[PDB]
Amino acid sequence: AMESKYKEILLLTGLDNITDEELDRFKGFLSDEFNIATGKLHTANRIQVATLMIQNAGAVSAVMKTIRIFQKLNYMLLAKRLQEEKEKVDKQYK
Amino acid sequence: AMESKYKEILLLTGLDNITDEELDRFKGFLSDEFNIATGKLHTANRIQVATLMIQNAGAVSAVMKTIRIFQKLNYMLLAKRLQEEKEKVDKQYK
Amino acid sequence: AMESKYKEILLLTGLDNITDEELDRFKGFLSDEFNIATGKLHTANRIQVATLMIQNAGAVSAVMKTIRIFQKLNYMLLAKRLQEEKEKVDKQYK
Amino acid sequence: AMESKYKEILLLTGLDNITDEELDRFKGFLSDEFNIATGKLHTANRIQVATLMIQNAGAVSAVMKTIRIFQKLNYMLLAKRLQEEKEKVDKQYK
Amino acid sequence: AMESKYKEILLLTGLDNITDEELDRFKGFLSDEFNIATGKLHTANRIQVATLMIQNAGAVSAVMKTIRIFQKLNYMLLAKRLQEEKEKVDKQYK
Amino acid sequence: AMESKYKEILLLTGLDNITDEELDRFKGFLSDEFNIATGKLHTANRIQVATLMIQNAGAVSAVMKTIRIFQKLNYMLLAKRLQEEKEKVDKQYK
Amino acid sequence: AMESKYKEILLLTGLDNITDEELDRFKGFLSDEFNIATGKLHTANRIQVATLMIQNAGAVSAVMKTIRIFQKLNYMLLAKRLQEEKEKVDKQYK
Amino acid sequence: AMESKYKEILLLTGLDNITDEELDRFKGFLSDEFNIATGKLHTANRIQVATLMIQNAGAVSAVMKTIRIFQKLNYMLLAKRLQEEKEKVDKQYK
Amino acid sequence: AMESKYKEILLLTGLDNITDEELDRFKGFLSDEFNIATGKLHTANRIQVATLMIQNAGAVSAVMKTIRIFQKLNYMLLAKRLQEEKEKVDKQYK
Amino acid sequence: AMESKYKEILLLTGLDNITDEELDRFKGFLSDEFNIATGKLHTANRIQVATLMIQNAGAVSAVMKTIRIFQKLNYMLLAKRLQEEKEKVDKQYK
Amino acid sequence: AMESKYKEILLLTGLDNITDEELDRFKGFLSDEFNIATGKLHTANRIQVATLMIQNAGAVSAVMKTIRIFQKLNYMLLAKRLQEEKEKVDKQYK
Amino acid sequence: AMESKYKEILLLTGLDNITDEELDRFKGFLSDEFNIATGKLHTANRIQVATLMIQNAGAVSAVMKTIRIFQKLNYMLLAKRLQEEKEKVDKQYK
């Protein structure tokens, strides 16, 4: 399904690549896109964080907000690639 | 009957999906909608809890209060879906 | 009831925000306000700890002692806010 | 029987070797091969998980889907070995 | 009776204080004082363990052996206190 | 919110620019504006230091004290700019 | 109690001030005052180390030995202050 | 019994002294003396690991293999001491 | 890949040869080709600097801008050689 | 087994000798022999890195690729020795 | 506080003015006023040296000894000024 | 104990005095007295190096070899003093 495929993008192409130090910076500017919380985020395995994000918004808004953040944290090289892969999947369901 | 159908919603679409940890949190904020009790709730198999809830209020008030709680515990993704399915069944008997 | 409302304050505004490391420090200076115990406290889910505290003192003394501790552990930012919310609820029942 | 032998493969050669962390990753990409569920899977002893898988599909489809997953989660070293052992048992009943 | 009082010592002053991790270590060096057993001990609620100990030796030998163990597992702070309380009760019946 | 915007100023315009050697000098003259401490400050990632500062004073007093320090450590070029950006945000909420 | 007050001294006036590097040096000359151990000490959060020290000696001997060590590791500035605060508390119970 | 005494050697003189990092290295070269396994060993409290070792070989072969490993991992200082203590106990039963 | 080969050029033929003093001069005229920053650049191991450059522009624009800078800092002897090697690799993929 | 012996070569003769700085350089030219990844490699204890390498290729291809890399990073002194030791073990199984 | 003000004198009026060559000469005649050491002093940033001096003597004896040294190393022009500023601060607390 | 006293000599009279540059020279001529290793020594805090030396030889052979090295690296001024202090401690236990 489109859902499973989006998740594979998030996990395999996204988190299975990104580092840590940067995740700490991401957390410092978080809460600006999702109605999550503080102390609550501090130690949550990538899988847990992705799951909590989806349990709230979804594979639609979560992906969009991720794209938006990737553009803020300077991360443009990985933001362009995600945008391209997104469009590739969209074409399959247009 | 409308009753049996509501029960199928509760059990198959509701409890047959939700986790545990969250049930503990539900219990911690319970007693706010139903005239049930304490120590009495601690270990009651989903089937027992649903049955006790209905034996008191019913398939009308129990479902309404469940909808209301699902909106409190942040659980909105599963609350919207329940609300949609509810309306679908209501249309059949309007 | 005033009781349920106080609990919502404790849980949603208090524990649903505070971290862990600090909870360990809290435990190290505990037993100074409540007639609880040792080894007994080591691993007790926030819900369990709140419940045990109330089962002993109550929503009156437990809240007061929490306010007092929040002022000791330097935690003043969250102590002022709790004090303000407390006064807001008190006004409703004055 | 072929059934008991397949189970011995699954349990002794498979699960009696694989780690945990990876099981969490497996769970995150599950539900893609079996008509099982969520929250339902979270804590199920290897024996319980194998049994539920078989109770649904069987020793035929469950083994095939396991082989397929072992190839996805990069796990190729253990996937080749399982494929070899499978062929060895197939020869005995050809 | 002297028996009930000794039990109150064991339970309230002893077990109602001691932790877990240490209980595992106690179990690892057990069977050296009581003619109990293995696998049999692994999961036995403090109340069950105390009861089985007494059902064998009694409130006389069980207490003496507990005192002796408390001195081995380094636990001297709690061993001195138990010895003092013991002497206090002995004086009442001398 | 005004809070998030102030934080973006602090982090992106402030710390994401300033060097290290100078941070050591800042630390040597610190404790003069905030009720923090010693040895406690020695190794705290910019994100940690900003967070601890806010957890005490806030986005109001922390920013004001930062402005004041930036004027002491000769740092005037970056102090004027911060003051200008501050006034720009203030105008939006006047 | 005198105990709680001594602990506040140890933690707030002592450890909440001292650095790390020096703690490593302390550990290198430890075992000379307490019947503790090696490898066992290597990574123990200040709270854990204080607790283990007390669980053995107490708030009487642990404080005395700390005073003595503070005088050895050259640390005299913090040793005089601790001695003064100690005498201040002693006067309250003389 | 000789068994209990050997266990006291293993636990008190051995594991109650050795560190962690080195245990990870031990695990990396394990499986070379005992017919145990992988993933299975990763997280097993010293008590659990000792027990599993004995449940397989015993207090005779387990001790001998431990002595042998202690000589490989360079650990000679602790290997000589264990060998001496072993001989001391052997003399008691010669 | 062309990417890996370009990196080998940068690192082995470029940085593994150039000195320091000159790197300081390079830094003084930097920020003119890449959207990087200040204080941020001061101490970044050649590997870190190359990686940050690529993480922004890439192996295409980073190499081109390097060529351009090598021509400015008078460095022509090493600029001609880089240009020749570049053309040699281009021919392989024309 | 040949496997265990190869591992002893890798760990004791290889990694237990090589430095760090050079490991960073190795990482910069990695991914050219193994189908591993980025950010994923950044902080992985020698034991973890060896294990991941083997979990993919094995003690056959991993050793061969290591030999090949040791010849690239100029490291010839340690490459000749590894090649000699390899041949010595091969002779034992020819 | 008087302490902070003395530090500002030391750092801003003292070290933020004095050169290097002379610091080497100061070091050559040091150890005559403070119970510090050798090799230990060789490379210690002004901030580190001031801090170590205070950590030993204090803002009282350290300042007095500095005044005394400033009079020895011929440095009289800066010694008179320091003495004047000292008296000015003393008057504020007389 | 004689051991602790020897360690105090090593650390306080030895390492707490010696410089760095010379430590690099020591390392270059090391491995000639102890069965240690290379790359392994490069960055090991004085405390770590002393501990590893003792973990191998001891406070007897390590001290003797240190004395011997101190005589080689020309260091005679500190070698005579160590020899004198050694004899002073020996007299106490003759």
Residue numbers in the entry:
A (entry chain G), B (entry chain B), C (entry chain E), D (entry chain D), E (entry chain C), F (entry chain J), ...: 0 to 93
What wording appears in the published article?
AIM2 is a critically important cytoplasmic dsDNA sensor that activates caspase-1 to provide host defense against pathogens. AIM2 contains an N-terminal PYD and a C-terminal dsDNA-binding HIN domain. For the AIM2 inflammasome, upon binding of the HIN domain to dsDNA, the AIM2PYD domain clusters to nucleate the formation of ASCPYD filaments. The AIM2PYD filaments in turn act as the platforms to nucleate ASCPYD filaments, resulting in inflammasome assembly and caspase-1 activation.
The symmetry that was found, a rise of 6.0 Å and a right-handed rotation of 138.9° per subunit, generated a reconstruction where the PYD was seen to be largely α-helical. The AIM2PYD subunit in the filament shows a six-helix bundle structure that is highly similar to the AIM2PYD crystal structures in isolation. In the filament, AIM2PYD forms the core while the GFP tag packs tightly outside. Estimation of resolutions by Fourier shell correlation between the densities and the fitted molecules gave ~5.0 Å for the AIM2PYD region and ~11 Å if GFP is included. While the GFP-AIM2PYD filament has the symmetry of a right-handed 1-start helix with 138.9° rotation and 6.0 Å axial rise per subunit, the sequential intrastrand subunits do not make direct molecular contact. In the AIM2PYD filament structure, the type I interaction is formed by Ser3, Lys6, Leu10, Leu11, Asp15 and Ile46 of the α1/α4 helixes of one subunit and Arg24, Phe27, Phe28 and Asp31 of the α2-α3 region of an adjacent subunit. Type III interactions are mediated by Gly38 and Lys39 of α3 and the nearby Asp15, Asn16 and Ile17 residues of another subunit.
